[PDB]
Coordinates of C-alpha atoms in Angstrom, one line a residue:
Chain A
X1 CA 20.8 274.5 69.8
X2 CA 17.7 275.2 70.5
X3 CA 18.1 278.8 72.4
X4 CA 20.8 276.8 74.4
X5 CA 24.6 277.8 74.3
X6 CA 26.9 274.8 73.9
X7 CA 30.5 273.4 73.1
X8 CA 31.4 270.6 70.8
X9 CA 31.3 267.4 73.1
X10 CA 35.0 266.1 73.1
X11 CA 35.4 262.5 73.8
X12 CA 38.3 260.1 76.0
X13 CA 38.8 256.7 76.5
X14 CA 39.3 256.0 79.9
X15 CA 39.8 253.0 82.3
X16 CA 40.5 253.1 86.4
X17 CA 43.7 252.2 87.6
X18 CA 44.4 249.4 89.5
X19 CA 43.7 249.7 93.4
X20 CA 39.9 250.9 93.1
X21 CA 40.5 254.2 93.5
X22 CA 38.1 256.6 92.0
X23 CA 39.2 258.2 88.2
X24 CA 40.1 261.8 88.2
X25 CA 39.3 263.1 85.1
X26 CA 40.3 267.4 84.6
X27 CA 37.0 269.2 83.3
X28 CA 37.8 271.2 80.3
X29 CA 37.7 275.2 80.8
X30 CA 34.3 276.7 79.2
X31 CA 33.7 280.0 78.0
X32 CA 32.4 282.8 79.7
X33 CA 28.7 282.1 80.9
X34 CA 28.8 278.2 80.4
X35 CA 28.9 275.2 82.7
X36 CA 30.5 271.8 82.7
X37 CA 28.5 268.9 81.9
X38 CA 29.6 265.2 81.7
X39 CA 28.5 262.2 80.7
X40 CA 30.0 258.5 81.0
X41 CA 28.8 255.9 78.4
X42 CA 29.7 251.9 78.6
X43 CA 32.0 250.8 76.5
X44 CA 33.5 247.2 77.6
X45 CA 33.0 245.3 80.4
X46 CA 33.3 242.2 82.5
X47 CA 32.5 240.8 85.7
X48 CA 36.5 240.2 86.4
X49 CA 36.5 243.2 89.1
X50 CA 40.4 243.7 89.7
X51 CA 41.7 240.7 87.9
X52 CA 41.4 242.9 84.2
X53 CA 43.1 245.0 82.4
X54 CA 41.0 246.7 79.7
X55 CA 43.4 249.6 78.9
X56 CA 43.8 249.1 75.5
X57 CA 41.2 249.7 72.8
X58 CA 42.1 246.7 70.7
X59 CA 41.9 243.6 72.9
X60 CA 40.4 243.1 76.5
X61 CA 42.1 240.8 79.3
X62 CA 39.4 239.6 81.8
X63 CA 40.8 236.9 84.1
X64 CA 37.3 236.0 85.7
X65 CA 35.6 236.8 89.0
X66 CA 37.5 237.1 92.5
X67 CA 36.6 233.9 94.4
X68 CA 36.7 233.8 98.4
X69 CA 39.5 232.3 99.0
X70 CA 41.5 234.6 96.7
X71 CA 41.9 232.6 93.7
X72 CA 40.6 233.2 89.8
X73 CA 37.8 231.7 89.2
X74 CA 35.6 231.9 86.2
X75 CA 33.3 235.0 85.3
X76 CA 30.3 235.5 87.4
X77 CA 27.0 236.8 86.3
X78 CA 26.2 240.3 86.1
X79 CA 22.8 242.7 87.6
X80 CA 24.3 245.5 87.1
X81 CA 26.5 248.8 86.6
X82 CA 26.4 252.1 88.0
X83 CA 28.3 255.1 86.9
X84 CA 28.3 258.1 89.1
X85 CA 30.2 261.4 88.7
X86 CA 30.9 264.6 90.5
X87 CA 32.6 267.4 89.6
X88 CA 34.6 269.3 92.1
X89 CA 37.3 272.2 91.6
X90 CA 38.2 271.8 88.0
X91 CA 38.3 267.6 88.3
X92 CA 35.5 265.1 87.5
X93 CA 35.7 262.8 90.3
X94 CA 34.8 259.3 88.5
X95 CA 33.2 256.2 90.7
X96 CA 31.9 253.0 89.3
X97 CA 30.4 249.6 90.7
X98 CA 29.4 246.6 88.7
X99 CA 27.0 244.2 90.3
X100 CA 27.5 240.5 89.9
X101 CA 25.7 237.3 91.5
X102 CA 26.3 237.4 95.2
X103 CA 27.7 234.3 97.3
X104 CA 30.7 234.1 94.9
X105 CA 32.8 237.2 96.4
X106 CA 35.0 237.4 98.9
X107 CA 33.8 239.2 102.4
X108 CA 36.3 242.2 102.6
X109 CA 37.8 243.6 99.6
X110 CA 37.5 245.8 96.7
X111 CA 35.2 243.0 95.1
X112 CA 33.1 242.2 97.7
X113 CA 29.6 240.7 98.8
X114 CA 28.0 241.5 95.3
X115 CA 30.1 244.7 93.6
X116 CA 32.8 245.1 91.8
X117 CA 34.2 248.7 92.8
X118 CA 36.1 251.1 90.7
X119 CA 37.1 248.0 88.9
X120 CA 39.5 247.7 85.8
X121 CA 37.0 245.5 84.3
X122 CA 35.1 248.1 82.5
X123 CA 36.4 251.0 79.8
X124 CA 33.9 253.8 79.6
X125 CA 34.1 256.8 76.9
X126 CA 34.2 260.3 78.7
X127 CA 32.3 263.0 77.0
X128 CA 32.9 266.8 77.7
X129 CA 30.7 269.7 77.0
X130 CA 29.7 273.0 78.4
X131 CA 26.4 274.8 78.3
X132 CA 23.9 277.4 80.0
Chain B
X1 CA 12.5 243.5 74.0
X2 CA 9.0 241.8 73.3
X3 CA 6.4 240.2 75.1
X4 CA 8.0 236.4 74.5
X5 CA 11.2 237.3 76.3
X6 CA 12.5 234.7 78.8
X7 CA 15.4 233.8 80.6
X8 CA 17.2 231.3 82.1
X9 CA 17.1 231.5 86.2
X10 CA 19.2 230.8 89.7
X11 CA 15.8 229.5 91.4
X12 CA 13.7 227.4 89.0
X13 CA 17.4 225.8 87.7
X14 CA 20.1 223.4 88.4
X15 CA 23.4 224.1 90.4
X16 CA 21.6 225.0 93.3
X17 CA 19.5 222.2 94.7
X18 CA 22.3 219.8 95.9
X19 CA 21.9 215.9 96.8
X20 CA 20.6 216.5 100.1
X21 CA 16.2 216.2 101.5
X22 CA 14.4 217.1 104.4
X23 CA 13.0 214.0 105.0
X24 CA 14.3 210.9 106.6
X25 CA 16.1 208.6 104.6
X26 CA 15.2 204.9 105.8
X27 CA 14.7 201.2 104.2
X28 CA 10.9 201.3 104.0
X29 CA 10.3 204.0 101.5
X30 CA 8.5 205.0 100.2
X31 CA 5.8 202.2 101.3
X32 CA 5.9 202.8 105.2
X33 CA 4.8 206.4 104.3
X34 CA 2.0 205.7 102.2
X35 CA 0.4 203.3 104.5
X36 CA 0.7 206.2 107.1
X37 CA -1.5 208.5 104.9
X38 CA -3.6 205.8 104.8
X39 CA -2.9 204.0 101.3
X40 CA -4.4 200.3 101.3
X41 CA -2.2 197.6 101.3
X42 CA -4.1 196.5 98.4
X43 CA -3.8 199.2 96.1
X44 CA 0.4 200.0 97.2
X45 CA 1.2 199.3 93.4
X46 CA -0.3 203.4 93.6
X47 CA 2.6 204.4 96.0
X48 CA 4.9 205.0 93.3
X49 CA 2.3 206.2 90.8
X50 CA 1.0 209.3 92.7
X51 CA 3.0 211.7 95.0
X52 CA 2.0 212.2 98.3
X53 CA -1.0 215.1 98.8
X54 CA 0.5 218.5 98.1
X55 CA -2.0 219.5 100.9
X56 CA 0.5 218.4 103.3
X57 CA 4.2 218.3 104.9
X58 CA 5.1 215.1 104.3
X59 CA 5.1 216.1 100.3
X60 CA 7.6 218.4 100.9
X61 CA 10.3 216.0 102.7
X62 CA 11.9 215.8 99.2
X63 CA 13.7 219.0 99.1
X64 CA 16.7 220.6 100.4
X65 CA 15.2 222.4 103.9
X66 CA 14.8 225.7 103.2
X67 CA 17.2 227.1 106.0
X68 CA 20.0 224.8 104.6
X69 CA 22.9 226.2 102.6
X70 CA 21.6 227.4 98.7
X71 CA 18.2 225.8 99.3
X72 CA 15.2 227.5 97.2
X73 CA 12.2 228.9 98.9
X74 CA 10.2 225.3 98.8
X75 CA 7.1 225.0 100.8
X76 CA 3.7 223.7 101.0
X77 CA 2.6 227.5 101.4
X78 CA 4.7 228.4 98.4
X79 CA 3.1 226.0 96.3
X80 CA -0.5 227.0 97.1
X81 CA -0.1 230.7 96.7
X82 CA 1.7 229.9 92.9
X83 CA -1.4 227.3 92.5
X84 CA -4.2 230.0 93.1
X85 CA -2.4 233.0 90.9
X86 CA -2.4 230.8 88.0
X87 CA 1.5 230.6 87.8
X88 CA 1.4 226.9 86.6
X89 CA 4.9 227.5 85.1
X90 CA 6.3 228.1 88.3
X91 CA 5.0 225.0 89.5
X92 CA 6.4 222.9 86.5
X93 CA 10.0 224.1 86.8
X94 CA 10.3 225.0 90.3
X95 CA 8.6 221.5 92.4
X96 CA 7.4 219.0 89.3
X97 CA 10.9 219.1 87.3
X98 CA 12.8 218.3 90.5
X99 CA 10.6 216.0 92.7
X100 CA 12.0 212.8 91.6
X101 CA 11.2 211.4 95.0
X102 CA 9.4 207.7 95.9
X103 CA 11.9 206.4 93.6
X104 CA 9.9 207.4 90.2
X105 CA 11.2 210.0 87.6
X106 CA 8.5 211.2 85.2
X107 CA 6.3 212.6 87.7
X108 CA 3.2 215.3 85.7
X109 CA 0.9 217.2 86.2
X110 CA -1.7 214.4 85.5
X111 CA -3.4 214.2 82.2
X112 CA -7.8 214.7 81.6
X113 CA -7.4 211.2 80.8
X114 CA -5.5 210.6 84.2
X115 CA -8.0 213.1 86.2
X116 CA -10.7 210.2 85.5
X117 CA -8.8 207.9 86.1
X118 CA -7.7 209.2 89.8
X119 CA -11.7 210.1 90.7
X120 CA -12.3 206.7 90.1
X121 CA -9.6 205.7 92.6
X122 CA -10.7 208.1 95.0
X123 CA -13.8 206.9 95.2
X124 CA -12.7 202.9 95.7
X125 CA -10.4 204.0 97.9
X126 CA -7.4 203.1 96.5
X127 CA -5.2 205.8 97.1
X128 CA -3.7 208.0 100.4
X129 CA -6.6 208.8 102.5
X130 CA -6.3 213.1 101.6
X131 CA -6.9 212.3 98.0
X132 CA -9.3 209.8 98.1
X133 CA -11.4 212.6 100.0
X134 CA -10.1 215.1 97.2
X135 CA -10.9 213.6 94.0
X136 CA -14.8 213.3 94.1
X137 CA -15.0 216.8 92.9
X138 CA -13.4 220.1 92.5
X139 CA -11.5 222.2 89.8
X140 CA -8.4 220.4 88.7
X141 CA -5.2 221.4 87.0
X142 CA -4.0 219.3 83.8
X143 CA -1.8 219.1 81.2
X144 CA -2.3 217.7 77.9
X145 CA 1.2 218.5 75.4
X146 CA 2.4 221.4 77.1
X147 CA -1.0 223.0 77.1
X148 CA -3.0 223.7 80.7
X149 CA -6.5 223.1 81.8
X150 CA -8.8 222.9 84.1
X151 CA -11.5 220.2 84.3
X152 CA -14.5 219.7 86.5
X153 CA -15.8 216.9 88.6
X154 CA -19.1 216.5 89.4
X155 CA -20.1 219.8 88.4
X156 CA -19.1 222.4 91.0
X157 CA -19.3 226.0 90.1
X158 CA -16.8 227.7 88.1
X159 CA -15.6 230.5 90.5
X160 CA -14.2 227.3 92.6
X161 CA -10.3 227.7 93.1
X162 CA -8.0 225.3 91.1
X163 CA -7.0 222.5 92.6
X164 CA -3.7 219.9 92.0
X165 CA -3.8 217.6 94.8
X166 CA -0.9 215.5 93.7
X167 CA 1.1 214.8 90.4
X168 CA 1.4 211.8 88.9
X169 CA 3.6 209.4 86.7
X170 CA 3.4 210.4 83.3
X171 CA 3.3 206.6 82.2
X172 CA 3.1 204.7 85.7
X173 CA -0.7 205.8 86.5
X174 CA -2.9 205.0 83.6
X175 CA -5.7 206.7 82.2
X176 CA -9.3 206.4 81.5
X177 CA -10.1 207.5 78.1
X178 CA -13.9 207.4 78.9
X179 CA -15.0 210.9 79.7
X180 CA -17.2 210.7 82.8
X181 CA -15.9 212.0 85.9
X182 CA -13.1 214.8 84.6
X183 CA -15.3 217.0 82.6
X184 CA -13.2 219.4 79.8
X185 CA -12.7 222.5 77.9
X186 CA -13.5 221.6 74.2
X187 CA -13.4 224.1 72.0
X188 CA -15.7 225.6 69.2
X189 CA -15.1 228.1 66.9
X190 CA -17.7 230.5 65.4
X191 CA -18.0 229.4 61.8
X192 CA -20.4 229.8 59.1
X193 CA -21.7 227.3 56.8
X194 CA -22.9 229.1 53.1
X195 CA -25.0 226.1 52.3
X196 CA -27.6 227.3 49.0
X197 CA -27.0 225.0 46.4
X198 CA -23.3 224.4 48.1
X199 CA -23.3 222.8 51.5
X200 CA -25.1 219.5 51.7
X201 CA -26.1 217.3 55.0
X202 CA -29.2 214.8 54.0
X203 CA -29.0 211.3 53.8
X204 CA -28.4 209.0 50.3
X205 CA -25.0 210.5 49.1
X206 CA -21.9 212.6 50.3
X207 CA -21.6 214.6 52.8
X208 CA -20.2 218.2 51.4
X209 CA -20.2 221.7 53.3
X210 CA -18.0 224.9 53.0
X211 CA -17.1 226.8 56.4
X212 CA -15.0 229.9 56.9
X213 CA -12.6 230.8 59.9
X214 CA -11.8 234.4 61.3
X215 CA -8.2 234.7 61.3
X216 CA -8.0 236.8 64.5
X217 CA -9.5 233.9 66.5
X218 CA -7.1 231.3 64.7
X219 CA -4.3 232.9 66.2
X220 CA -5.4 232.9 69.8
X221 CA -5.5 229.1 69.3
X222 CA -2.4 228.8 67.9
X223 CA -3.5 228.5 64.2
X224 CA -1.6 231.3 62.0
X225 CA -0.3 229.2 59.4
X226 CA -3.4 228.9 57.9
X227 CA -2.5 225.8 55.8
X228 CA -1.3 223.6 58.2
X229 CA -4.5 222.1 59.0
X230 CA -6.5 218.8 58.8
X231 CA -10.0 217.5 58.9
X232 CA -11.9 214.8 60.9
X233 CA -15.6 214.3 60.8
X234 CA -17.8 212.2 63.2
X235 CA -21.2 210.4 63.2
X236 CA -22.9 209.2 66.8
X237 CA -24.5 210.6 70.1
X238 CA -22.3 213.4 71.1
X239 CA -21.4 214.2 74.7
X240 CA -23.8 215.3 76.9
X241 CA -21.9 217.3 78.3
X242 CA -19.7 218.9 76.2
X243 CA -21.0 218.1 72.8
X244 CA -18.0 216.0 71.7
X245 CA -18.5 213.0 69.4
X246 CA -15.9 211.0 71.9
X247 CA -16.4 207.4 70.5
X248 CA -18.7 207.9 66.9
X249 CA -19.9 205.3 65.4
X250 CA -18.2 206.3 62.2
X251 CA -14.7 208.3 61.9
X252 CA -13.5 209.7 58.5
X253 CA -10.3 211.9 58.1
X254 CA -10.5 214.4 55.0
X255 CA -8.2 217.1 53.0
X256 CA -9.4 219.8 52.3
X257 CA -8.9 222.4 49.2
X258 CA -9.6 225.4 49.4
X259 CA -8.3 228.6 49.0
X260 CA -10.8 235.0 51.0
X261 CA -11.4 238.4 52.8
X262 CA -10.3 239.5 56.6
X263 CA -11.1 235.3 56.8
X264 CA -10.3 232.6 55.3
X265 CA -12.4 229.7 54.3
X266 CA -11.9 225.3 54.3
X267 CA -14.0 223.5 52.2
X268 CA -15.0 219.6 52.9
X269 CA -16.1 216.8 50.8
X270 CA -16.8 213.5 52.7
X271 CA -15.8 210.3 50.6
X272 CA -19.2 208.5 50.4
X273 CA -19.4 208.1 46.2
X274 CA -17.8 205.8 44.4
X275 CA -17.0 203.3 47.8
X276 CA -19.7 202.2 50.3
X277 CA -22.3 204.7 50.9
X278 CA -22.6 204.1 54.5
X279 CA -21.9 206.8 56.1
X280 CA -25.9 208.0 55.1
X281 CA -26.4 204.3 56.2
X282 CA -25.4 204.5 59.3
X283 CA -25.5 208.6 60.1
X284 CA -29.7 207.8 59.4
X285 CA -29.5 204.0 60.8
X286 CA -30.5 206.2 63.7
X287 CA -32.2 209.6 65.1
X288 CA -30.0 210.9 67.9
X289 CA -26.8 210.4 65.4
X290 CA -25.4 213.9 64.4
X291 CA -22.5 214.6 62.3
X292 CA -19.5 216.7 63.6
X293 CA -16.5 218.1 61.9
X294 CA -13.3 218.5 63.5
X295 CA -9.8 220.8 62.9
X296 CA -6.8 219.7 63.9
X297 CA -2.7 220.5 62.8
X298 CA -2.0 218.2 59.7
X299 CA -0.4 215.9 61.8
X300 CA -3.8 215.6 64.2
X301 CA -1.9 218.0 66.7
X302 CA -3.3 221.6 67.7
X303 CA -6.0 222.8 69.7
X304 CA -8.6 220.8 68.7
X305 CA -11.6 223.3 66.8
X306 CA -15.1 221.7 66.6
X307 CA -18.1 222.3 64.6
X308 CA -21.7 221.7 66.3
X309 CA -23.0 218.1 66.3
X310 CA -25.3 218.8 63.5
X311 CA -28.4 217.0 62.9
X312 CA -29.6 216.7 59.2
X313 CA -29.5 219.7 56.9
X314 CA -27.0 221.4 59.7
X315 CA -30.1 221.7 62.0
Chain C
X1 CA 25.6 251.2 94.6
X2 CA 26.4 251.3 98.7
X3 CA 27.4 247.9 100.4
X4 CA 24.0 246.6 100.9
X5 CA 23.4 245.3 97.0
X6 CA 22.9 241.9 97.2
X7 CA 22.1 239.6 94.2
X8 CA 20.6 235.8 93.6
X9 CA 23.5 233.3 92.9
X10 CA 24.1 229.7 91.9
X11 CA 26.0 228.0 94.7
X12 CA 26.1 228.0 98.7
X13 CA 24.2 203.7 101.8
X14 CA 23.8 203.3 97.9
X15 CA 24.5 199.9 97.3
X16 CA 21.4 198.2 98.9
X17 CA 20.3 196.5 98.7
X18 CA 22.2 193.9 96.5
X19 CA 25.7 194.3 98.4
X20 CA 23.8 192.3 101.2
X21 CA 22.3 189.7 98.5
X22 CA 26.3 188.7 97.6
X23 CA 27.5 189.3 101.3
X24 CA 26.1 186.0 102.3
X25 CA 26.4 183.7 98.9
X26 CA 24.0 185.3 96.6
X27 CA 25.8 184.6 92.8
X28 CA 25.7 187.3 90.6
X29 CA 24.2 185.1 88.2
X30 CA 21.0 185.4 89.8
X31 CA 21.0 188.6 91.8
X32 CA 17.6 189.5 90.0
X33 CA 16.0 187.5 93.0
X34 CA 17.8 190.0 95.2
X35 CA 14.0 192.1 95.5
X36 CA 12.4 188.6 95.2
X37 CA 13.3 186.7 98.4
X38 CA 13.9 188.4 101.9
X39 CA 17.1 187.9 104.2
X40 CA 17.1 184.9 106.1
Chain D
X1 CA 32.2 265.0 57.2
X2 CA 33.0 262.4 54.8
X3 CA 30.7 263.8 52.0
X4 CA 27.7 264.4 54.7
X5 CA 26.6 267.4 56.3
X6 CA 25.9 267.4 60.4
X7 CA 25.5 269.5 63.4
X8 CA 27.3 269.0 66.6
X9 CA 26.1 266.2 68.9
X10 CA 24.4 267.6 71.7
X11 CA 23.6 265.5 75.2
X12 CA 21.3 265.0 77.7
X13 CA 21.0 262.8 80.9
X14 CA 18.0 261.0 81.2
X15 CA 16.2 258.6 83.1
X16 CA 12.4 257.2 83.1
X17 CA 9.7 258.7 85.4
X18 CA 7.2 256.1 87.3
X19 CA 4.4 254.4 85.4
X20 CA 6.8 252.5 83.0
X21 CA 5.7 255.0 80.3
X22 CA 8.3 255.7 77.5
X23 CA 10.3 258.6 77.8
X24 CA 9.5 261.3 75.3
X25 CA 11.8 263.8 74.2
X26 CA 11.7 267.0 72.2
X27 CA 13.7 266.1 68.9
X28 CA 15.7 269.3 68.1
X29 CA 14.7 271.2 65.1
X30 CA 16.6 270.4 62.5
X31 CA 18.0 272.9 59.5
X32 CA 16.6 273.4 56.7
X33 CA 17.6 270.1 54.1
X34 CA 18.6 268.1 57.8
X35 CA 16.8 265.4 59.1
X36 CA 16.8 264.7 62.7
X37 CA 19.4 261.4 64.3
X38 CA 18.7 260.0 67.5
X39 CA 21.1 257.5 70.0
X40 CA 20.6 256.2 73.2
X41 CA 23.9 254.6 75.1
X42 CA 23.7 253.1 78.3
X43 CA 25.2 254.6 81.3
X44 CA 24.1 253.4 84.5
X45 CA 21.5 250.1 85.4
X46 CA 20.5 247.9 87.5
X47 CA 18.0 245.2 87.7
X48 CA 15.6 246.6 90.3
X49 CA 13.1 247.5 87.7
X50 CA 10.9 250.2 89.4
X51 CA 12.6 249.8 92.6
X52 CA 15.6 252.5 92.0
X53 CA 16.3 255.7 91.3
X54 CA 18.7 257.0 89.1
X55 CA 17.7 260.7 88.0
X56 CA 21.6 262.0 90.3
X57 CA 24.3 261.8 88.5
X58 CA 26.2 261.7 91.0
X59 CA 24.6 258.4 92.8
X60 CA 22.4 255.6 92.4
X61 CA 19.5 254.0 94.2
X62 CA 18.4 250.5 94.0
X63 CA 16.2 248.8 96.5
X64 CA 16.2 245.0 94.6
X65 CA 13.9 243.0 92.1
X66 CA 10.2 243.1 92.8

């Protein structure tokens, strides 16, 4: 495509496990002479942080916005949503932070000040490609 | 997203402000306070009707303090820099919406009508001592149905930055429909008259004429449905100042039926056959009357458009 | 985002005078005199 | 593919330069009896407006609203 080498982009529906830990994702093996690419696109989302569970395509459970004191409260507004990935060794490292109003979250955390990080509140689709 | 995009806010909404001020909370107010400022005791039926000078502190008292938990960034500094860039929306939904203070709810930006009114006060002295100083002339800010502008008293230049002293009661302080003091910003619309054997302005019959209005120019005034509109035409002494027959001796509404090119065109047909002729008798019972024709929204709403105060045969 | 995003948000008497009017024998019948006529 | 003809969907990661000028970019040339399809899908943001930076894949600046 134009004077460029490339793969059919291949596509996965993926969602972080709970615990905020970054999503490991294996790169696919190119040819000969071509490169891995990647690209992360939003799918669904919600403010909910850890208290979500968006693994399944066909309905979305979003419990609201992690108060200070613990509880479940309702969702919070959103600013924003980063997505940010590395490759490393065969393995796209995955991180992800979703922004919300600030003075709702707790201090310490995995939702904390004004992010949401690595949160199960968000699916994103995975695309996979390799060029030159 | 276009141009008329807007949102919903954290700092010019609710939730935030909480029931809580900066000023002291006491059995005298708001009266002891506008004595201090230098209010007569005469003329305290004002206290409620006009807020204290925005020039000052004291104004200010009626917010949460700034350094308090959730307060908004509320200060006489803050209003004065949103005052002189012109960000008059800021003004209306960050301080006027939410003073509520000296026990009175509907405080405004005042009216032209209310402008007048508050130079005359000024200058009896019967309001606080910073406005009576402030209202004998100056650039002011008002508000007539949702719409700003600025008018003049006394005549000071036009490069003269915008001033808004204090708000007022929307229906507590009353205006002055006499235009005197508050000088404003009429409007007139370049328009041609085909006259020939058509248009007609000379006494012993009807008054008839047939204009024709640029459409780019009717939607800067908010005129792009080009048949929602109305007629009004006057006969007396316009305005000195502005041109406006305010208070004509003679007031006629008309509707108007016509229906051309990159303009469009309003014809006008004054009923003075077949009922009393005076309009001629009284728009020649005198030399310095001219005749003045005026657009409005059907329902008398809109910015108002006006035609020159013509004298006969649109001279 | 590192930790130092930070984002707007939405959180962080009254009876007078006409208690003191009834305290001492004012009827309700004609508490509009309350604003009227001062304490004794 | 279900009675119409297409070419592989090809990607690129893109963000826009200072200026808040639109972002052009070079449609690919398309063969002959093709016509060329465009989508954009959002990937990162932030409200900073032209306070950020997001041209690294790998991280993201944002210094705040103006």
């Amino acid at each position: 495509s134009d004077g460029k080498t490339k793969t059919p982009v291949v596509s996965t529906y993926e969602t972080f496990q709970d615990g905020g830990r970054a999503k490991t994702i294996n790169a696919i093996e190119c040819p000969t002479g071509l490169n891995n690419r990647f690209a992360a696109v939003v799918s669904s989302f919600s403010t909910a942080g850890q208290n979500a569970n968006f693994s399944s395509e066909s309905a979305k459970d979003s419990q609201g916005t992690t108060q200070k004191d613990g509880s479940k409260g309702p969702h919070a507004l959103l600013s924003g949503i980063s997505l940010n990935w590395t490759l490393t060794n065969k393995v796209w490292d995955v991180t992800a932070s979703i922004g919300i109003e600030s003075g709702i979250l707790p201090t310490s955390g995995i939702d904390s000040g004004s992010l949401l990080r690595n949160p199960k509140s968000l699916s994103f689709i995975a695309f996979q490609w390799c060029e030159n | 997203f276009n141009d008329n995009y807007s949102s919903t806010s954290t700092v010019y909404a609710t939730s935030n402000e909480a029931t809580d001020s900066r000023g002291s909370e006491h059995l005298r107010y708001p009266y002891l306070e506008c004595i201090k400022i230098g209010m007569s005791r005469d003329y305290l039926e004002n206290c409620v009707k006009v807020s204290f000078p925005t020039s000052q502190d004291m104004f200010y008292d009626a917010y949460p303090s700034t350094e308090s938990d959730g307060a908004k960034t509320r200060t006489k500094e803050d209003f004065s820099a949103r005052l002189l860039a012109g960000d008059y929306d800021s003004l209306q939904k960050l301080y006027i919406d939410f003073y509520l203070a000296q026990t009175t709810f509907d405080w405004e930006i005042p009216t032209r009508d209310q402008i007048e009114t508050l130079v005359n006060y000024a200058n009896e002295g019967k309001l606080s001592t910073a406005l009576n100083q402030e209202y004998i002339t100056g650039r002011f800010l008002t508000k007539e149905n949702g719409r700003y502008d600025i008018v003049n008293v006394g005549g000071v230049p036009d490069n003269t930055p915008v001033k808004l002293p204090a708000i007022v009661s929307k229906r507590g302080l009353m205006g002055t429909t006499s235009v005197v003091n508050a000088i404003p910003n009429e409007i007139y619309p370049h328009i041609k008259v085909y006259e020939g054997t058509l248009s007609r302005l000379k006494p012993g019959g009807a008054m008839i004429a047939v204009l024709e209005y640029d459409v780019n120019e009717l939607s800067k005034h908010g005129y792009t449905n080009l048949w929602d509109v109305q007629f009004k035409v006057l006969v007396g002494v316009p305005h000195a100042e502005t041109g406006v027959i305010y208070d004509p001796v003679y007031e006629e509404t008309v509707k108007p039926y016509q229906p051309l090119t990159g303009k469009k065109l309003y014809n006008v047909s004054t009923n003075d056959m077949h009922n009393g002729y005076k309009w001629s008798n009284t728009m020649f019972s005198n030399s310095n009357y001219k005749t003045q024709i005026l657009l409005t929204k059907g329902d008398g709403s809109g910015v108002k458009l006006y035609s020159k105060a013509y004298s006969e045969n649109f001279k």
